[PDB]
């Protein structure tokens, strides 16, 4: 069994060896590998060990996606334990189901890109917040379809990931522009639609994202511009922030008051683009309900 | 069945021409004008245990008369007739002529789930009846016979109900709606002899020790009757106007 050093080292190595890998995917793979090497025979003990490893996996890379992946993994093992009832029989089936689950979630970026690239028109002006690989893949798919468009991206001041995405997008010969986080209200009137990533989809259909997303959502609503969000299926989490203060503090801080995360209400979101398809925000809760019945 | 009708009757008292009809006819007519397909009648037997013979000449649909012994009281009659009692009882008296809508009483028995409902006539020895502000629930019942010198009220009664309205001229019509467990308690205790004289005051006193409630309907503009000869003459005078619509 892993001893809090093999687990963290495995997580960091998984992230480092594949820099194009989501944090939640790396966490799920680490949990599956931990389940492979257990050397114990009890479903209760396995659940306890997994849920205890969740905290030490969330100690580093405290993003919401890791917690969502851990909750999804716990629900997965509970679902398997319902069906079989012998830890010995259930172990192999959980291992194989985790293998298929990893293979399925590895294609989420491609599915989202294929489903979403049709919403970008010729001559459109996309507005993006920060660096996200899903939006990058969507724009790559749009370019592969011979569409021509412009892109504005904010600098994301706390860590200049906006410039990183601008570089990664100029690498594809896409005409892009970099704007300040305070220039969003100046730029919204030029853009035709807004595409942002998500670090987690909350129960009501809102999103949890980098600190500058709420301003862009509010400005787009004021200017009546569509606001599209791309997020993977494993980012669904049963949390309901009543407001900005209500989101748990373990997601705001640790990568005078510099939160790293804010919450966007579902009323400001037009459509969610997931590997499950194109959804209204109200759909998300439905899915997140069907999992827990 | 919701109610069982019991008529008290213990020339005799029940046979008394009032508008060419006997005294006992009016309560029976009142009962059978509002449902009451069947009625239990207790027959007096002090003069003779054969009054049911000429009772059976009445034109009412169903009559169940039973002879009695030489002497017996109202509660004693009730504990005699228990074996045929199955639900809430509606105890009446033969000497009662009135035109009140009976629902006005039984509604108080229905809506509030009362343990006792009674009827009284407004004015027109004494009995002191204290009711609440709404004039429906009665909180105090007394007579000067057992009232030594002064009317006495418990502090907690006024604590719960800080306004008590007192009446002295009220006339008891002896029309009672009673729960079954009241009869059962009467069965467990043979001390009580008369309903109006001992049972009802006991129930009123037991209101303020799952709990029991007692309600009274005080009618203000209608008819009432009693045993007295002057009351008999008044009933004879009023029946001519009363019997026109009945």
């Amino acid at each position: 069994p892993m001893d809090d050093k093999e687990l963290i080292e495995y997580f960091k190595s998984q992230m480092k060896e594949d820099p194009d890998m989501a944090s939640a995917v790396a966490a799920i793979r680490t949990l599956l590998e931990f389940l492979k090497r257990d050397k114990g025979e009890t479903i209760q003990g396995l659940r306890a060990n997994l849920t205890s490893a969740i905290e030490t996996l969330c100690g580093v890379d405290s993003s919401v996606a890791v917690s969502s992946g851990g909750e999804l993994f716990l629900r997965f093992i509970s679902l398997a334990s319902l069906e079989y009832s012998d830890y010995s029989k259930c172990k192999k089936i959980m291992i194989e189901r985790g293998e298929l689950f990893l293979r399925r979630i590895s294609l989420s970026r491609n599915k989202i890109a294929d489903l979403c690239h049709t919403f970008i028109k010729d001559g459109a002006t996309i507005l993006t917040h920060a660096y996200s690989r899903v939006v990058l893949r969507v724009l790559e798919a749009a370019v592969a379809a011979k569409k021509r468009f412009s892109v504005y991206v904010t600098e994301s001041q706390p860590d200049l990931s906006g410039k990183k995405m601008a570089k990664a997008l100029c690498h594809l010969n896409v005409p892009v522009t970099v704007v300040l986080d305070a220039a969003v209200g100046y730029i919204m009137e030029k853009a035709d639609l807004v595409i942002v990533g998500a670090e987690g989809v909350v129960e009501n259909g809102g999103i949890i994202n980098k600190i500058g997303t709420n301003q862009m959502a509010v400005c787009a609503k004021a200017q009546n511009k569509p606001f599209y969000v791309v997020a993977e299926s494993f980012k669904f989490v049963r949390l309901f922030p009543l407001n900005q203060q209500d989101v748990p503090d373990k997601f705001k801080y640790k990568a005078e008051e510099h939160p790293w995360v804010d919450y966007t209400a579902p009323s400001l979101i037009t459509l969610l683009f997931t590997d499950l398809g194109v959804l209204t925000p109200s759909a998300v809760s439905d899915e997140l309900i069907k999992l827990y019945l | 069945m919701e109610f069982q009708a019991v008529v008290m009757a213990v020339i005799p008292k029940p046979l008394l021409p009032v508008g060419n009809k006997p005294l006992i006819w009016y309560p029976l007519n009142l009962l059978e004008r509002v449902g009451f397909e069947e009625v239990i009648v207790v027959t007096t037997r002090d003069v003779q245990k054969a009054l049911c013979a000429e009772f059976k000449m009445k034109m009412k649909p169903d009559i169940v008369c039973i002879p009695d012994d030489a002497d017996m009281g109202t509660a004693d009659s009730l504990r005699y007739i228990y074996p045929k009692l199955k639900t809430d009882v509606l105890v009446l008296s033969c000497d009662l002529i009135t035109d009140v809508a009976l629902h006005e009483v039984v509604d108080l028995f229905r809506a509030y789930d009362a343990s006792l409902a009674m009827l009284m006539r407004k004015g027109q020895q004494r009995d002191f009846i204290g009711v609440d502000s709404t004039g429906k629930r009665l909180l105090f019942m007394a007579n000067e016979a057992d009232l030594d010198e002064e009317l006495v009220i418990k502090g907690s009664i006024l604590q719960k109900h800080p306004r008590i309205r007192f009446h002295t001229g009220l006339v008891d019509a002896h029309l009672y709606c009673l729960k079954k467990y009241i009869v059962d308690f009467l069965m467990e205790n043979g001390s009580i002899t008369s309903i109006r004289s001992e049972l009802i005051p006991y129930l009123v006193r037991k209101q303020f020790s799952k709990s029991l409630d007692i309600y009274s309907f005080i009618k203000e503009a209608n008819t009432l009757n009693l045993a007295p000869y002057d009351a008999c003459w008044n009933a004879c005078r009023g029946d001519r106007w009363e019997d026109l619509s009945r």
């Binding site: 209760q44 003990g45 306890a48 060990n49 849920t51 509970s78 | -």
Partner: protein, 197 residues
């Protein structure tokens, strides 16, 4: 909300005739989400009906239940324990006495905790006792008999309080008893008071 899922529910049967010699906890198949949070100790599931789920890796379980809380999972069976394990290196006498049966001063020595002499604790601490799935009922029945309450979490809290009280009564530097393994602590205490008298 995954914290409320259970696999087996402990039904509690308390005997008024003999709360110590009788009364038992029986585990039944319960594969559904519970109404309350769940704690896991030695593969045993405790419904946190009277207590609340806690987080962190602080030692001294006394500080978990001093706040009205209880950890999600702790003990030797947990790979990542939240009690900062310690050994209580005195169970050699417990292993030696495990082969001893019930048959003066030793009688009152074994009287604690139940008030009646018993050798069940040595069977608990015996080396040939794997803390598997088949032993949950027996360990939980021992815990339930020990305490005086209808709630299993309150039974755990009362058990640890009794252990701490006896440790301070005999003067064993109570810091060396954090409730990491209640049965190891109680076996050490019973054997030590047997040796003393």
């Amino acid at each position: 909300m995954n914290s409320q899922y259970m696999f087996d529910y402990p039904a509690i049967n308390i005997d008024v005739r003999c709360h110590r010699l009788l009364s038992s906890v029986s585990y039944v198949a319960y594969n559904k989400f519970h109404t309350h949070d769940v704690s896991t100790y030695e593969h045993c599931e405790i419904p946190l009906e009277k207590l609340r789920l806690g987080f962190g890796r602080r030692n001294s379980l006394a500080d978990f239940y001093s706040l009205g809380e209880l950890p999600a999972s702790w003990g030797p069976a947990c790979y990542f324990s939240s009690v900062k394990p310690m050994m209580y290196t005195f169970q050699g006498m417990a292993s030696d006495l495990s082969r001893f049966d019930l048959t003066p001063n030793v009688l009152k020595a074994l009287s604690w905790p139940l008030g009646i002499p018993d050798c069940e604790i040595f069977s608990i601490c015996s080396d040939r006792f794997v803390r598997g799935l088949q032993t949950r009922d027996q360990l939980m029945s021992y815990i339930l008999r020990m305490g005086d309450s209808h709630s299993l979490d309150e039974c755990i809290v009362q058990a640890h309080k009794k252990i701490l009280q006896e440790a301070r009564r005999l003067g064993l530097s109570d810091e060396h008893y954090n409730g990491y393994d209640l049965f190891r602590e109680i076996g050490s205490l019973v054997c030590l008071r047997l040796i003393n008298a």
